[PDB]
Amino acid sequence: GELAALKELAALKAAAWKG
Structure with a gap:
């Protein structure tokens, strides 16, 4: 779950960041 998040x-x- 830590990675998944x-x-x-x-x-x-x-x-x-891109829009």
């Missing part, structure tokens, strides 16, 4: 976070930070 980070992959969900990564996906969202990417998105936010």
Whole structure:
């Protein structure tokens, strides 16, 4: 679950950064 969480976070930070 710790790893899993980070992959969900990564996906969202990417998105936010790009628009």
